[PDB]
């Protein structure tokens, strides 16, 4: 029981320590005055609740940045792409909001798992839990990591469509909104990360 539990925890222990260090670093970073383009001069206030949350809350912005490994070039590029979108019915504002929400909620759920799985809690799992339960928690943490990386890949791919001028989207923000919607809206779903986190939290 104890021997098997230790092996499972060792699959994720080193990674959790590294993530905890990198999350701390990110929290300490000073945000540029222009917020990487995520500001009210490029995104109209009072159009979408999630856009508004991003405009109002530096903590949510920091979560969003960390969801993309604080890759400043990638963040800026996505922000400038999203700022070009348009639509006849303001649907694009909902989609922009969905993108922001998806990033900060996945990162938030991920950070909650890292924060819960302290070295003390890892020790508690090895000593006190059935191996079936430890394996489930360990595999769930890895699933949460994958959700995070699939999100990063969605963003890479959206940027990819813009770079490729898919459907002529470089020259037309309405087409851009539709390309992003058709290509990626179905894939944007932070609820899965929330479910995985719940499955980690419950046994604990």
Q: What is the CATH number of the domain that holds 191?
A: 1.10.3160.10
Which residues lie closer than 8 Å to 95 by C-beta, 6 or more apart? 85, 177, 180, 181, 185
Annotated resolution, angstroms: 1.9
Burial (CB count within 10 angstroms: exposed 0-12, middle 13-18, buried 19+), residue 69? middle
Determined by which method?
A: X-ray
Count of structural domains, the chain: 1
Q: Give Cα 32 to chain centroid, integer Å.
A: 20
Q: Tokens 């699939």 belong to which residue?
A: 150
Tell me the residue range of the domain where 158 lies: 1-204
């Amino acid at each position: 029981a104890m021997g098997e539990n230790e092996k499972l925890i060792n699959k994720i222990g080193p990674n959790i320590e590294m993530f905890a260090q990198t999350i701390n670093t990110d929290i300490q970073k000073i945000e540029p005055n222009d917020q990487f383009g995520i500001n009210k001069t490029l995104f109209t206030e009072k159009k979408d609740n999630n856009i508004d949350f991003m405009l109002k809350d530096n903590r949510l912005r920091r979560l969003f940045y960390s969801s993309l490994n604080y890759d400043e070039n990638k963040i800026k590029k996505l922000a400038t792409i999203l700022a070009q979108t348009s639509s006849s019915n303001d649907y694009h504002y909902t989609l922009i909001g969905l993108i922001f929400w998806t990033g900060f909620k996945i990162q938030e759920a991920f950070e909650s798992a890292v924060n819960i799985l302290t070295k003390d809690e890892q020790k508690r799992l090895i000593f006190n839990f059935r191996t079936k339960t430890v394996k489930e928690i360990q595999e769930n943490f890895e699933k949460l990591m994958q959700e995070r990386n699939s999100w990063i890949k969605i963003v890479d791919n959206i940027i990819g469509e813009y770079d490729k001028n898919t459907g002529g989207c470089k020259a037309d923000g309405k087409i851009l909104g539709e390309v992003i919607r058709v290509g990626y809206e179905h894939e944007l779903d932070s609820n899965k990360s929330m479910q995985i986190l719940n499955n980690i939290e419950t046994p604990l």
